[PDB]
Amino acid sequence: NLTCDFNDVYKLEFHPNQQTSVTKLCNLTPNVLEKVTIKCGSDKLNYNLYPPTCFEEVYASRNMMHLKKIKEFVIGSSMFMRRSLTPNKINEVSFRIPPNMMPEKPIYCFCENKKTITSKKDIINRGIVEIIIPSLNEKVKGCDFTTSESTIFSKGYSINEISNKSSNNQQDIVCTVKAHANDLIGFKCPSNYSVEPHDCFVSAFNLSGKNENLENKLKLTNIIMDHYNNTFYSRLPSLISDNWKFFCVCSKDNEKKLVFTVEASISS
Amino acid sequence: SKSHKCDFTKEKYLLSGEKEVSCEIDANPSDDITFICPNKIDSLCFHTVNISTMSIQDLLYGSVVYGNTLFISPYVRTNTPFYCFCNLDTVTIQKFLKINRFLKDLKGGNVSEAQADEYLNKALNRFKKMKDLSKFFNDQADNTTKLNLPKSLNIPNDILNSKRGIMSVFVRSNNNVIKGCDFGNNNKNYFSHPISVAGKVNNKVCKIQGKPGELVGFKCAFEENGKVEPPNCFDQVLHKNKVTDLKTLIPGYASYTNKHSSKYPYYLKIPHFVNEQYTIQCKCKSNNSQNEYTFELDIQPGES
Ligand SMILES: *[C@@H]1O[C@H](CO)[C@@H](O)[C@H](O)[C@H]1NC(C)=O
Numbered sequence: 001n002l003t004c005d006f007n008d009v010y011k012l013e014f015h016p017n018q019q020t021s022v023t024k025l026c027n028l029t030p031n032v033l034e035k036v037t038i039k040c041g042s043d044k045l046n047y048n049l050y051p052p053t054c055f056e057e058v059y060a061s062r063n064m065m066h067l068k069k070i071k072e073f074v075i076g077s078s079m080f081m082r083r084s085l086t087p088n089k090i091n092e093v094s095f096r097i098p099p100n101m102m103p104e105k106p107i108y109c110f111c112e113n114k115k116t117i118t119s120k121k122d123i124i125n126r127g128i129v130e131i132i133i134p135s136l137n138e139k140v141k142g143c144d145f146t147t148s149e150s151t152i153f154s155k156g157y158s159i160n161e162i163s164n165k166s167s168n169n170q171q172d173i174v175c176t177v178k179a180h181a182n183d184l185i186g187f188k189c190p191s192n193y194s195v196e197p198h199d200c201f202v203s204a205f206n207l208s209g210k211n212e213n214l215e216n217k218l219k220l221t222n223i224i225m226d227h228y229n230n231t232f233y234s235r236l237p238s239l240i241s242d243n244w245k246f247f248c249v250c251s252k253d254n255e256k257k258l259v260f261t262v263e264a265s266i267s268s
Numbered sequence: 269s270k271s272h273k274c275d276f277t278k279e280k281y282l283l284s285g286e287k288e289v290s291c292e293i294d295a296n297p298s299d300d301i302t303f304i305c306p307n308k309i310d311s312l313c314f315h316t317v318n319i320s321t322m323s324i325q326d327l328l329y330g331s332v333v334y335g336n337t338l339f340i341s342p343y344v345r346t347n348t349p350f351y352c353f354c355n356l357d358t359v360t361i362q363k364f365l366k367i368n369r370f371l372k373d374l375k376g377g378n379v380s381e382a383q384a385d386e387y388l389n390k391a392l393n394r395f396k397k398m399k400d401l402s403k404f405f406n407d408q409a410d411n412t413t414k415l416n417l418p419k420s421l422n423i424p425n426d427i428l429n430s431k432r433g434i435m436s437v438f439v440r441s442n443n444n445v446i447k448g449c450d451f452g453n454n455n456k457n458y459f460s461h462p463i464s465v466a467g468k469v470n471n472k473v474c475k476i477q478g479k480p481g482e483l484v485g486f487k488c489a490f491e492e493n494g495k496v497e498p499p500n501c502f503d504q505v506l507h508k509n510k511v512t513d514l515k516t517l518i519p520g521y522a523s524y525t526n527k528h529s530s531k532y533p534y535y536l537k538i539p540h541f542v543n544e545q546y547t548i549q550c551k552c553k554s555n556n557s558q559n560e561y562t563f564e565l566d567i568q569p570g571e572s
Pocket residue numbers: 191192
């Protein structure tokens with residue numbers, strides 16, 4: 001599927017009398033906002049992942065050089081999950097592909113099965129996970145509160161704007177994006193801010209205010225609410241019934257409110 | 269889960285016709301009703317209610333009341349009503365009418381960018397306004413007969429210095445027992461892990477696993493002046509045997525607790541996404557060593 005299982009599919013067991021190391025490849029080409037997953041090792045399979053912090057750390061090439069950090073190599077990446085089954089090692093990892101405006105590029109994470117044979121040597125059934133980051137052509141209709149020169153969103157804000165040194169913290173920052181059907185929307189907030197509501201794209205704020213309309217009016221897909229990265233993404237539906245307006249708030253005490261608001265025009 | 273409110277501050281209720289003003293509310297389990305009365309009479313809601321008095325924990329076991337809000341229990345057995353009377357004394361009406369005007373806060377085209385700004389900025393302060401009101405109400409003690417409002421509403425000191433209101437609630441029954449620990453000796457078995465039932469409970473620790481999106485919790489043995497460790501559970505928990513802010517482990521969580529004592533249960537709604545595995549705990553603390561237990565929670569990664 002969109003998972004590179006190395007235990008129950010793409011099996012990395014050794015065949016008998018093995019004396020050389022082979023390398024299975026699991027190439028995936030996801031679309032933006034989709035979830036990729038690596039299953040490797042278990043309580044009955046002693047496989048280790050490289051880098052053990054993948055996907056938070058990945059390799060930029062299949063040859064395990066130029067190790068890089070995904071927060072900076074693939075801006076926008078979200079929903080990093082890590083699940084363990086044997087103690088003292090984690091075996092199922094996953095994350096959500098972010099919007100990209102630059103050319104496609106791969107990221108790599110390896111998974112090795114190692115054993116010493118009898119001179120003597122050690123043989124490895126390596127499994128390379130090759131993910132291609134899709135390229136889009138228009139930036140996301142959204143707000144980046146972490147930079148005025150965002151590589152993901154259309155509107156951006158320098159920190160001199162979201163801090164209260166020049167303006168008082170009573171005048172908030174309202175970022176309106178207009179968008180239509182099948183459009184990517186989202187926002188990113190700085191690290192120690194909190195997003196209200198907890199499920200912004202499942203529940204937003206009505207323009208009467210303090211209202212979580214739970215979005216029966218606008219049914220959004222590919223909803224991503226990463227509260228660890230304050231990165232939020234979704235896509236408006238195939239058809240817009242009526243024009244709608246909703247908003248969500250990033251808040252931090254003694255700071256301005258950073259508010260993301262969308263007007264969805266009727267589209268088909 | 270819907271959220272109900274009966275605000276007797278409104279002119280629609282203060283300048284009404286008959287002498288018995290009545291707001292009616294039909295709730296369900298895990299809902300939350302809020303009651304804003306200028307001068308609470310008879311019983312003190314939501315801690316003590318009027319039957320035509322009883323304390324809410326005996327009527328609807330598993331409920332929590334914080335500030336002026338009742339989080340209904342995530343398990344009710346029988347459909348039950350409650351009543352809370354509010355004495356609108358002539359000048360209490362007049363007094364708040366003078367404060368409600370000072371506050372002064374469906375098909376809008378909003379073609380100009382600027383008028384769209386005003387409607388949103390208007391909606392933004394009602395958001396910011398209500399937040400600071402529940403914060404001030406939570407700081408309030410449990411025994412409070414006279415409602416007061418937070419300063420920095422800028423309301424004048426001159427304004428701070430007939431009708432009878434009755435709000436009546438009915439809440440339905442359900443059958444889904446609480447995924448939690450009940451550390452009190454009673455045979456009602458409202459929780460997944462009582463100690464009246466053997467085995468659920470070992471070495472004074474109650475070990476529960478929680479999945480993303482689930483609501484779990486615990487309720488200490490009842491006493492009037494008990495405490496929880498950490499004092500701010502669930503907002504601060506024990507993690508790796510040190511007091512950690514829960515927001516650093518599972519941001520996006522919700523909680524339903526009482527900051528002033530351990531009398532009421534403690535509920536944690538695990539967020540829609542937790543990224544790692546996390547073991548956390550909170551402890552019941554008492555001058556009675558037989559009433560002290562640890563609530564250990566295994567939070568399992570996933571999505572929802
Ligand atoms: C966020 O808060 C933590 C804890 O106070 C602090 O250590 C960290 O440096 C803060 N980060 C930023 C970007 O302010």
